[PDB]
Design a protein around this ligand. Structure first.
Ligand code: YIB
Length: 236
């Protein structure tokens, strides 16, 4: 991700078939002639899409031009959470499946994985960053406190941001409860809240979204478990 000062991000297409699939996803969703009520509703929860972009002198070099969801914040606290029971898609080989489950074998049990967080600390006037190893080290014992850490800001636990996150996730859950046409593997929720002394939840990362004729039960499971953890944190 490259943050552009104009309030967009440039995401370089991943190698094929992943990058091309993510392009086609955005193209289908934001199709100008699209009057599919499900897909029109979905736009609310995605970064706004500005189309394929490549440098003037390099047509080979493909990016997606997306809304920077953090742009309206002064000191954004950002957490990326991969959603679902399976990080591998319906067309994964035995090795690929093994690779993906190996990356985090608790995915079926938990239904989500913290990919990373960036948390502004008022007292320090500085950022605390967690990488992929943080979330992958979280067990069932430690997942609540693992998530809680994101909301330690402003000399307190930010229960306001926790509550807001629940309410916004619930809207995304409601969308998933009323669509049977897309299944989402290895996609994320991007959480943002304001860390400054003076909330966004968006769906991102669509290299493994596939047509379906059933409920995306793994994604729903993830959302519901995430909501339950967040709910529990409100009792801290
Ligand atoms: F550390 C930091 F770079 F600042 O953290 C940041 C800052 C900004 C974003 C961010 O903002 N709007 C986004 C829209 C899409 C994506 C995206 N799509 N697929 N993969 N990532 C990321 C987006 C993400 C992380």
């Amino acid at each position: 991700i490259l943050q552009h000062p104009d309030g967009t991000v440039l995401k370089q297409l991943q190698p094929p078939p992943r990058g091309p699939r993510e392009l086609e996803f955005y193209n289908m969703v934001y199709a100008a002639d699209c009057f599919d009520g499900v897909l029109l509703e979905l736009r609310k929860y995605l970064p706004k899409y500005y189309g394929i972009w490549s440098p003037p002198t390099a047509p080979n070099d493909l990016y997606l031009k997306l809304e920077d969801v953090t742009h309206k914040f002064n000191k954004p606290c950002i957490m990326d959470v991969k959603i679902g029971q399976k990080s591998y898609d319906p067309f994964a080989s035995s090795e690929k499946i093994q690779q993906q489950v190996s990356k985090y074998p608790l995915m079926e049990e938990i239904g989500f994985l913290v990919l990373g967080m960036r948390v502004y600390h008022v007292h320090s006037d500085s950022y605390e960053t967690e990488n992929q190893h943080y979330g992958r080290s979280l067990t069932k014992e430690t997942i609540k406190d693992g998530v809680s850490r994101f909301f330690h800001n402003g000399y307190c636990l930010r229960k306001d941001a926790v509550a807001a996150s629940i309410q916004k996730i619930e809207k995304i859950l409601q969308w998933f409860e009323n669509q049977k046409q897309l299944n989402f593997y290895a996609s994320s929720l991007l959480f943002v809240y304001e860390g400054s002394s003076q909330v966004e939840v968006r769906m991102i990362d669509f290299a493994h979204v596939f047509p379906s004729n059933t409920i995306d039960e793994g994604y729903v499971y993830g959302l519901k478990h995430l909501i339950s953890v967040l709910r529990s944190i409100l009792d801290n």
